[PDB]
C-alpha cells in the first residue's frame, strides 16, 4: 500500500500540522464541555428538542437507480434528513493552536461530508446538524484544536485575529461573546456564536498557558518558529510552484525534466 505522509518539515509547527492532518492521531483533550453546552453556544437548536428536517428520510424519498451514488454510505444526519448548520471559528495570529487553512485541511481529511471555508480571520465548517454537533464536541471544542483565549466560536462580527491580545490573553471580540472570570480563572461564554445573550453562562475552561501554546500552534512566527528554520516546507512550496508553472507552459515529460 501507501503510507501517507501529511506535511513536510522538521519543526514543531510542521509536526503539529501533520498531527492535525492525521486522522489516526488522537488529539489531546484539554477540557470537558457537555453536549448541551456546545449546542447552547452553537445557538442553532434548543437542547432536548428534536432536529428540524429539510427533507424526508432517504428511505421515504424515492430516487432513481444509481449504482455509483449508492456505493457511498450517507451520514446519519443525511439518513434521517436534517438541516445543514455551521460552526465558525476565529483564530488569533498570536500562537492559536489551530489556524484557518490548517483547520480546513484537517476537517476535510478527518470528517465526512463537510463544507470547509477559509478566510483570513474566519473559518467555517458546514454539515448536517447531528453530525456537526458530534464532531464539534468530540474534535472542535474539547481537544487541543481549541483554546478559549486565542480562539473562539463566533459568527456575525468577526475581528481581532490580527490584533494583539487583551490583558487576560484573550482574542479581541467586538461583541464580547466570552469573558474572563478571575475568581475561577476560567473563560465563560455569556453569548452564543452569533451574539444573543445566554441565560446561563457556560464554562469553556481556562486559557491554555503560553508555553503549551508555543508547542501546539500551527502558525509560523518570528517570535516563535519561523519558516527560515524549516527549509523543507519552503522547498516543497517552491517545487509546487515550479511544477504548476511548467505544467501551465507545456505539460510534457521533456519540459518537466527541468523540475
Amino acid at each position: 500500500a501507501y503510507t501517507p505522509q501529511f506535511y513536510p518539515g522538521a519543526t514543531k509547527v510542521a509536526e503539529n500540522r501533520r498531527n492535525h492532518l492525521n486522522p489516526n492521531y488522537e488529539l489531546e483533550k484539554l477540557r470537558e464541555i457537555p453536549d448541551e453546552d456546545v449546542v447552547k453556544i452553537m445557538g442553532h437548536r434548543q437542547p432536548g428538542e428534536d432536529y428540524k428536517t429539510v427533507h424526508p428520510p432517504l428511505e421515504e424519498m424515492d430516487f432513481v437507480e444509481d449504482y455509483a451514488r449508492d456505493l457511498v454510505e450517507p451520514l446519519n444526519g443525511a439518513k434521517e434528513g436534517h438541516r445543514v448548520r455551521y460552526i465558525q471559528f476565529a483564530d488569533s495570529m498570536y500562537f492559536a493552536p489551530a489556524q484557518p487553512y490548517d483547520r480546513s485541511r484537517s476537517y476535510m481529511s478527518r470528517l465526512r461530508g463537510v463544507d470547509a471555508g477559509t478566510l483570513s480571520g474566519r473559518q467555517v465548517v458546514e454539515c448536517r446538524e447531528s453530525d456537526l454537533e458530534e464532531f464539534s464536541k468530540n474534535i472542535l471544542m474539547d481537544t487541543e484544536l481549541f483554546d478559549p483565549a486565542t480562539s473562539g466560536m463566533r459568527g456575525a462580527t468577526v475581528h481581532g485575529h490580527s490584533l494583539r491580545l487583551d490583558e487576560n490573553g484573550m482574542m479581541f471580540d467586538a461583541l464580547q461573546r466570552c469573558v474572563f472570570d478571575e475568581k475561577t480563572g476560567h473563560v465563560m461564554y455569556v453569548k452564543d456564536q452569533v451574539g444573543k445573550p445566554l441565560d446561563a453562562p457556560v464554562d469553556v475552561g481556562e486559557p491554555i498557558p503560553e508555553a503549551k501554546l508555543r508547542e501546539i500552534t500551527t502558525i509560523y512566527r518570528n517570535d516563535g518558529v519561523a519558516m527560515r528554520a524549516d527549509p523543507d516546507v519552503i522547498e516543497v512550496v517552491k517545487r509546487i510552484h515550479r511544477a504548476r508553472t511548467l505544467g501551465g507552459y507545456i505539460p510534457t515529460n521533456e519540459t518537466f525534466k527541468g523540475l
Binding site: 478566510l119 480571520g121 490584533l163 519552503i234 517552491k238 510552484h241
Partner: protein, 51 residues
C-alpha cells in the same frame, strides 16, 4: 527587495530563469512576513489578510 537583488544579482545582472524567481520571491516574502510578525503596529495597520 531592491537591496537584496543588487547585493547578489544586480539591476540587470541575470537572465530570467526559474531559480532567480524562486530565490528573490521567497526571500522577499519571508522578510515581509517576518516584519509583519515583529511589528504589531504593521500587523494592526494591515489587519486584513488580503492587504
Amino acid at each position: 527587495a531592491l537591496d537584496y537583488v543588487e547585493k547578489k544579482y544586480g539591476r540587470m545582472g541575470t537572465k530570467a530563469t526559474m531559480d532567480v524567481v524562486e530565490d528573490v520571491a521567497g526571500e522577499v516574502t519571508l522578510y515581509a512576513l517576518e516584519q509583519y510578525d515583529d511589528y504589531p503596529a504593521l500587523l494592526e495597520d494591515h489587519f486584513g489578510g488580503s492587504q
